[PDB]
Design a protein around this ligand. Structure first.
Ligand code: MG
Ligand code: MG
Lengths: 266, 104, 244, 87, 233, 93, 203, 91
């Protein structure tokens, strides 16, 4: 480690790099020392250590901010059943309902991962990218943060024509043999589209239902819930609530992947 | 067996570029604490490996930014992995006569 | 919420204390109660602030420059300093002082012995701090070590909050000049918060508060307590917190 | 107070956006000189430095030195800022 | 927006394809979707209780249920105009959640404007993890604020130490004040101690403020001079 | 190197949307319903366009309508209509 | 129930108001609850509100009215200046006492009027403040003269022995530039909630 | 010396802010700026030209509800009262 470090002379003081290394060493050993800080929210911890669908409660959802629906004046009355009441000039999403729908969604995510399906996480909002990529990594899955070019599934051959396809084991090993030009040009459709802002990409949803793909979406109090197969009522605007739901879904899919790998090994 | 896309960004607009950016981003994240203290491939050169016709100026500028910052990591603290990742993106005198006069 | 960390062989410590320097009761007074109290106070101070997420050391470093919210700094400083002291104490988690450490000492103190250095430290402790405080053996950006006393919750890390001498009592001319120089240096920093750069690291913290010694050693014999601590401390820990 | 909600429009845009830049220095100097010459007769040496300053300004060209993104924002944020009911 | 048939009937549409022979191979999701069916029952469901209060939504007070005389001493012998109108929209429109604590909060910040200046973190830590005994105000995870007062008032009301709400509120306020005073004294004395033992603060709060003002003033001055010049000419 | 049209359609469908080509070739049978010539008044002039509308269906309750259009001759328009029909196959009860 | 949790929770805790965020009139005390984030939460745009807040905001503090509006934007202003005024006041250390002969309200249907001070100072008047140099009799604070003097986030009435011409008349309406020292005598608080300080110019 | 328009005079009892000294504050202030509104029918004031003349332009025209800023009914009553006044000698 640190092969190019030119250490200063013993008579001389520390160099800048040497000093930095010393600081790092101190940080690793004795900085986080005096106390330990239990019961506090670190944003990163929801992405890298999301809870299982089972262990989620209503309280956790409330803390995440999932309960906060759009607004009283921006109400799609189609979503009436999901909403608990109004408060602070804002519809508040029934969170027991949210929980049950999330569990249902989580189970279907797990199932397709187990079957070895292509899961696609779609999230066009600003802060969502990193968490989306993490989720995609967790299950051997896919994501979209930069905008969804209309017709990725309906007009697949024009759009997704010149990108490399692969082969895969019952495990996830590339088994790198040459794909034939006929073998390459076929569409590779997702087996689960999961969106974080269905109201912002109506188009993607429409192609999914045309292309015959089951889809999951965070339905806020202004979003149409009929436009998807498995709606999760919740707060799609705040970045952390979305991440929490997304991270849970990723964890559910991860589990199913692990189970598939285990059964392959067997 | 299953036929499946290589890149996790496959479905995005410019998938190859996005994938390329992701590795650099990961590296930056890894060595984000390392203290900081030119000949990068052209747009056209980058396109041939990256997006091609789907490569945009903004994407290229982002890529440059990612590379430059990584490069700036104090040479003494830099890693082998970082340098390997960056490796990809690199790349007559007149005199007087016998009689001491300058022709032009 | 800030809670006290679980020490290694905790039950054994509770039963005995520390073989030589601190009793079962005396160790409880310094750590299992006082540290807890400090943590609770820090939590109360920094419950709903942005400081709740940060560790004590990082809180102290954040807070150091701010004149108001000195209470938070004091508490954070105490918590960190006290755990450093406990780490130094602990029997395990026999070890001798390192060769490198000895060489560094020799370089620093005009080629003197480790026993001599200890003696100088205890003399400093006796003379400098009245009432409460801390006794550090620190290392700075110049590789040589030096002895650093602090008067109650003064940190060894950041020199404007060293809290190294008492202006409640009368002071020397040289001390005043040093203070003036420090102030000038601080003014030269030129940042909005106004915080200088400093790379002082503690190697041997010792707790000159009455929460350690007073039960076992009485109101006098603080020097004796300090000597005992110096004689029997975790050397492996010290060695670990020495090299760059 | 009386709020006024517009109907659904094709495109919110100001027909012409004014930048409201500062007036030219050379022009100002010329105006000052003119004002001075209104008083004090035709060309008295009270405005001796002013004329010199004007000359210095208008040596390379008659004027010394030679847009507001408001439409892009309106265009961007119209769909948000609408109180347009759902689809 | 019409209720979309085609987002939830996916497996049926694929099952038909599979039956036909349009699809040779089944999708990965097909079995999973069969196992876990969608809702597909996009109804407007009525609600009979306000959850916050616990008021009943559905019921109507009858003429027989109001035997005694009204305000202005008239006996109700008939249904009124509102008792005949079919109040179905009330069952369906979601309830406005009301709390007694909201009024107390409003009162507190009216009485203590400068409590608003104390910054408030709204990013929740685990709401399930907490466990506050409102016998006292000072809880551990929670800071000292008007909220804590209000919680104390509510606790008092519940326990019936102070039967009246106002008295309980006053008591909570008085508890708060002492704590605040103690907090104030702590900081000042800590500052004094720091001053005594040769601590050095590079930038005090007032000094910082002055510096901040100075830059703004400098910006103003140059602009103001230009404006005066413009006006002159 | 180089019924046939129907096979080509089926192959194209298989690429675009993963549908079974052999089924499309054999079991599906198509039928044109309307076969207009249709025009647009462009600045260049009147620009004619061949409009087809072609029901395709496996004779076991699986049926689809499709329309297609070509400025070039009607065969291309019919092909497009057929393609559209096979994309829109539908199980009638 | 969920309802109970909602009532408890940190958004319900912020007492609602629809007062202007831009109020160009006289500001005697804070209008809105200041709301801070942590740096980490700011980095991923989360403030503990309904929505994400724009990445353009780099300040940790803000003020708001509506969680979400018809315009599909939270009504906020990224500023928390009122905390700094309070902190300045605390630093100055001039204890607020009622000039009228009355008991201190903090000791012993609803009254909406301000109970004593609004909570800018819970300091008590009887203390002295020692230092290395000694016991501070006169509180020295730097401020700016406007024409009244701005002294650490508060405007204050001023008095002096003789009006100094050299400093004043050299720059008649640019007196705001030069910071002068002040000796703050006492701080009274009126019914409207205005802090009426009184300073003395030092030279 | 300098004019009054380019310098915000902070009042005596008020709080201020670093921003409050700026040009931008002054601009903001410039941007952002009665018995009939109090709740009494204006048709009591038809023998009181002094008060009705407040709701009238220098020439004599009645001011619009956009200008005067009244309740529509109250505005119409005011207008009626004014018209009554000018039918009489007074006003
Ligand atoms: Mg939304
Ligand atoms: Mg059609």
């Amino acid at each position: 480690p640190y092969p190019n470090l030119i250490p200063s002379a013993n008579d001389k003081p520390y160099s800048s790099q040497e000093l930095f290394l010393r600081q790092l060493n101190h940080s690793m050993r004795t900085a986080k020392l005096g106390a330990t800080i239990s019961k506090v929210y670190y944003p990163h911890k929801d992405i890298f250590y999301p809870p299982l669908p089972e262990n989620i409660t209503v309280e956790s959802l409330m803390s995440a901010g999932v309960h906060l629906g759009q607004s009283t004046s921006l109400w799609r009355s189609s979503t009436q059943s999901y909403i608990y009441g109004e408060y602070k000039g804002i519809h508040i999403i029934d969170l027991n309902q949210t929980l049950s729908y999330l569990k249902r969604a989580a189970k279907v995510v797990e199932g397709v991962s187990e079957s070895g399906g292509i899961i696609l996480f779609l999230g066009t909002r600003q802060g969502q990218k990193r968490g989306l990529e993490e989720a995609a990594k967790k299950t051997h899955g896919y994501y979209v943060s930069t905008r969804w070019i209309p017709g990725t599934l309906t007009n697949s051959t024009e759009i997704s024509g010149i990108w490399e396809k692969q082969e895969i084991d019952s495990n996830d090993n590339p088994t790198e043999r040459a794909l034939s030009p006929n073998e390459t040009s076929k569409q590779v459709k997702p087996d689960l589209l999961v969106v974080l802002n269905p109201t912002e990409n109506r188009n993607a949803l429409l192609e999914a239902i045309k292309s015959r793909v089951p889809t999951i979406a965070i339905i806020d109090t202004d979003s149409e819930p009929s436009l998807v197969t498995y709606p999760i009522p919740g707060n799609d605007d705040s970045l952390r609530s979305v991440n929490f739901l997304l991270g849970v879904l990723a964890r559910a899919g991860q589990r199913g992947l692990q189970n598939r790998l285990a059964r392959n090994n067997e | 067996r299953r036929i499946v896309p290589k890149l996790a960004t496959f479905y995005s607009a410019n998938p190859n570029h996005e994938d390329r950016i992701n590795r650099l981003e990961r590296l930056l994240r890894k060595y984000i604490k390392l203290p900081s203290q030119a000949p990068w491939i052209s747009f056209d050169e980058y396109a041939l490996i990256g997006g091609g016709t789907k490569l945009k100026p903004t994407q290229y500028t982002q890529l440059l930014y990612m590379l430059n910052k990584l490069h700036n990591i104090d040479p003494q603290l830099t890693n082998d992995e970082i340098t390997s990742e960056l490796s990809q993106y690199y790349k007559k005198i007149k005199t007087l006569d016998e009689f001491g006069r300058s022709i032009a | 919420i800030h809670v006290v960390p679980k020490l290694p062989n905790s039950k054994a410590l509770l039963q005995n204390g520390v073989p030589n320097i601190l009793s079962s009761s005396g160790f409880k007074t310094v750590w299992f109660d006082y540290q807890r109290y400090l943590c609770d106070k820090l939590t109360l101070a920094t419950a709903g602030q942005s400081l709740e997420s940060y560790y004590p050391f990082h809180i102290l470093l954040k807070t150091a420059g701010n004149p108001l919210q000195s209470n938070i700094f004091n508490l954070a400083s105490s918590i960190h300093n006290n755990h450093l002291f406990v780490e130094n104490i602990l029997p395990s988690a026999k070890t001798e002082p390192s060769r490198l450490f000895l060489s560094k000492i020799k370089d620093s103190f005009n080629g003197s012995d480790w026993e001599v250095v200890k003696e100088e430290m205890i003399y400093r402790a006796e003379n400098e701090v009245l009432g409460q405080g801390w006794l550090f053996l620190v290392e700075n950006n110049e590789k040589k070590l030096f002895i650093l006393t602090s008067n109650n919750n003064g940190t060894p890390y950041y020199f404007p909050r060293n809290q190294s001498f008492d202006l409640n009592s009368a002071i020397s001319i040289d001390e005043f000049a040093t203070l003036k120089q420090m102030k000038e240096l601080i003014g030269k920093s030129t940042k909005l918060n106004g915080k200088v750069q400093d790379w002082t690291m503690p190697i041997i913290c010792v707790n000159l508060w009455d929460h350690a010694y007073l039960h076992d050693y009485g109101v006098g014999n603080r020097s004796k307590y300090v000597k005992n601590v110096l004689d029997n401390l975790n050397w492996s820990v010290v060695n670990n917190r020495i090299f760059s | 107070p009386p709020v006024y909600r517009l109907p659904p429009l094709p495109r919110l845009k100001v027909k012409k956006p004014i930048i409201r830049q500062e007036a030219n220095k050379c022009l100002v100097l010329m105006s000052n000189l003119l004002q001075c010459w209104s008083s004090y007769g035709h060309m008295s040496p009270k405005c001796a430095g002013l004329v010199t300053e004007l000359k210095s300004c208008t040596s390379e060209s008659a004027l010394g030195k030679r847009k507001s993104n408001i439409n892009y924002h309106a265009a961007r944020l119209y769909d948000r800022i609408n109180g347009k009911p759902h689809d | 927006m019409k209720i979309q048939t085609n987002a939830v009937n996916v497996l049926q549409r694929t099952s038909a394809y599979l039956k036909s022979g349009l699809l040779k191979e089944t999708p990965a999701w097909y079995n999973v979707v069969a196992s876990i069916p969608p809702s597909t029952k996009f109804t407007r469901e009525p609600r009979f209780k306000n959850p916050s209060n616990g008021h009943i939504i559905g019921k109507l007070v009858d003429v027989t249920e109001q035997p005694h005389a009204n305000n202005k001493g008239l006996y109700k012998t008939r249904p009124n105009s509102s008792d005949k109108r079919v109040g179905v929209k009330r069952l369906y429109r979601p309830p406005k959640l009301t709390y007694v604590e909201d009024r107390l909060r409003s009162l507190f910040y009216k009485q203590h404007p400068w409590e608003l200046s104390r910054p408030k973190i709204l990013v929740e830590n685990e709401i399930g993890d907490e466990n506050y005994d409102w016998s006292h105000m000072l809880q551990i995870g929670r800071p000292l604020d008007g909220e804590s007062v209000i919680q104390r008032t509510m606790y008092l009301i519940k326990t019936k130490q102070y039967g009246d709400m106002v008295e309980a509120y006053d008591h909570a306020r008085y508890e708060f004040y002492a704590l605040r005073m103690q907090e104030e004294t702590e900081q000042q004395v800590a500052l004094e101690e720091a001053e005594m033992f040769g601590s050095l603060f590079g930038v005090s709060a007032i000094e910082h403020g002055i510096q901040k003002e100075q830059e703004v003033l400098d910006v103003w001055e140059k602009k103001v001079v230009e404006e005066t010049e413009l006006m002159a000419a | 190197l180089p019924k046939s049209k129907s096979a080509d359609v089926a192959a194209g469908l298989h690429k675009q949307t993963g549908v079974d080509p052999d089924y499309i070739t054999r079991k599906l049978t198509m039928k044109p319903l309307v076969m207009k010539r249709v025009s647009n008044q462009t600045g260049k002039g009147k620009i004619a366009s061949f409009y087809a509308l072609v029901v395709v269906g496996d004779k076991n309750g699986m049926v689809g309508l499709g329309e297609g259009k070509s400025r070039e001759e009607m065969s291309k328009a019919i092909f497009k209509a057929h393609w559209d029909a096979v994309r829109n196959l539908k199980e009638i009860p | 129930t969920l309802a109970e949790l909602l009532g408890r929770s940190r958004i319900a805790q912020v007492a609602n108001n629809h007062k202007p965020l831009t109020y160009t009139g006289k500001k005697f005390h804070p209008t809105h609850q200041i709301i801070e984030t942590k740096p980490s939460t700011l980095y991923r745009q989360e403030w503990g509100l309904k929505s994400a807040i724009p990445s353009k905001i780099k300040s940790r503090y803000l003020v708001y009215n509506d969680l979400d509006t018809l315009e599909r934007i939270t009504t906020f202003e990224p500023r928390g200046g009122t905390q700094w005024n309070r902190l300045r006041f605390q630093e100055m250390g001039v204890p607020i006492v009622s000039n009228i002969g009355r008991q201190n309200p903090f000791f012993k249907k609803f009254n909406t009027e301000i109970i004593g001070t609004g909570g800018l100072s819970y300091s008590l008047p009887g203390k002295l403040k020692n230092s290395p140099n000694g016991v501070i009799q006169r509180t020295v604070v730097p401020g700016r003269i406007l024409n009244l003097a701005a002294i650490g986030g508060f405007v204050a009435d001023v008095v002096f022995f003789q009006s100094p011409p050299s400093s004043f008349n050299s720059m008649g309406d640019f007196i705001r530039m030069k910071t002068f020292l002040f000796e703050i005598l006492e701080a009274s608080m009126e019914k409207n909630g205005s802090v009426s300080m009184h300073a003395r110019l030092l030279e | 010396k300098i004019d009054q328009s380019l310098s915000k005079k902070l009042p005596k009892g008020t709080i201020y802010d670093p921003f409050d000294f700026s040009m931008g504050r002054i601009h903001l202030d410039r941007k952002y700026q009665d018995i009939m509104k109090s709740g009494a029918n204006p048709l009591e004031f038809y023998a009181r030209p002094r008060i009705l003349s407040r709701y009238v332009t220098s020439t004599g025209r009645i001011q619009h509800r956009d200008i005067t800023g009244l309740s529509a009914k109250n505005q119409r009553r005011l207008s009626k009262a004014i018209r009554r006044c000018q039918a009489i000698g007074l006003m």
